[PDB]
């Protein structure tokens, strides 16, 4: 049997659920019949990105319609889609192209999870759960619901639930202390930077095996820089609800996982509008999309030397900004150190 705590057992089962991986692929409109879970190849995904990269260039520069049609055929031939009785849409709309780049960011993590799931599973003396836990290379511990850590984190969750996101409530079901192998060592040079904060990062539950084993990642070189608001970096929020929206939960599937990572921000390059940042302006360490609402700076506390903006959402004073909420982006995988993983239950307001 399993030697882990129950909630950790439930967590592992959840992140390695094969049926959720399929559901995710069906939502992305992949043809499960022509492209099974076991067909996902890392190379396949890279090629797909290059295609999206090239087609995006064509739509932007007025390339031949022939070109856009050929690229679309190559894309769909590489990643079989099932559109039902609908005619397959061409990759001629920049918004549909973005959606497709998002799907590949997700397919990269799903591929990792499946690989691990069918990897080294040969032992009778180890429960299947324990074996999979070990594949994660991450030490996971349950945080006691009554310690200071738990209390602070619960406050952070309750106080930063944004106004426009009142389509649901949030209940913290469990809090885990996580420590990915070698991550603390990688992040060490950044302890030197000032302005290190405890920020949020939401994702689908099907991404967690990739997140835990590989850590948070930046899109590969093939990915169009345009496929992202502020370029190819790692995104965070100080409003729990802004992130929570990326868990992609529903009344039918209410449980979501969310991360709390310590991020070395330093001098932030503050922006009010989307910008495809290719390189940072000497002297800056991160980007900060300014929003109209943000936690109350007066309430900002600290936990282990890291700033926690658990303040109640207040208006920020900036009027000329595209964003409703703050957005933080780092461009180096080493500028983040994952700390906590929260199991959330979305209580969706009813009929």
UniProtKB/Swiss-Prot annotation:
Entry's transmembrane regions: none
The record's account of how the chain is modified after translation: Poly-ADP-ribosylated on serine, glutamate and aspartate residues by autocatalysis. Auto-ADP-ribosylation on serine takes place following interaction with HPF1. Auto poly-ADP-ribosylation on serine residues promotes its dissociation from chromatin.
Domain PARP alpha-helical: from-to ranges: 1-118
Positions of NAD(+) binding: 201-203, 210, 217, 243
Chain ranges of the PARP catalytic domain: 127-351
Active site: 327 (for poly [adp-ribose] polymerase activity)
Places the protein is found: Chromosome; Nucleus; Nucleus, Nucleolus; Cytoplasm, Cytosol
Role description: Poly-ADP-ribosyltransferase that mediates poly-ADP-ribosylation of proteins and plays a key role in DNA repair. Mediates glutamate, aspartate, serine, histidine or tyrosine ADP-ribosylation of proteins: the ADP-D-ribosyl group of NAD(+) is transferred to the acceptor carboxyl group of target residues and further ADP-ribosyl groups are transferred to the 2'-position of the terminal adenosine moiety, building up a polymer with an average chain length of 20-30 units. Serine ADP-ribosylation of proteins constitutes the primary form of ADP-ribosylation of proteins in response to DNA damage.
Record remark: domains: The two PARP-type zinc-fingers (also named Zn1 and Zn2) specifically recognize DNA strand breaks: PARP-type zinc-finger 1 binds PARP-type zinc-finger 2 from a separate parp1 molecule to form a dimeric module that specifically recognizes DNA strand breaks. The PADR1-type (also named Zn3) zinc-finger mediates an interdomain contact and is required for the ability of parp1 to regulate chromatin structure.
Subunit structure: Homodimer; PARP-type zinc-fingers from separate parp1 molecules form a dimer module that specifically recognizes DNA strand breaks.
Family stated for the protein in its record: Belongs to the ARTD/PARP family.
UniProt protein name: Poly [ADP-ribose] polymerase 1
Gene name tied to this protein: PARP1
Whole-protein coverage range: 659 to 1009 of 1011
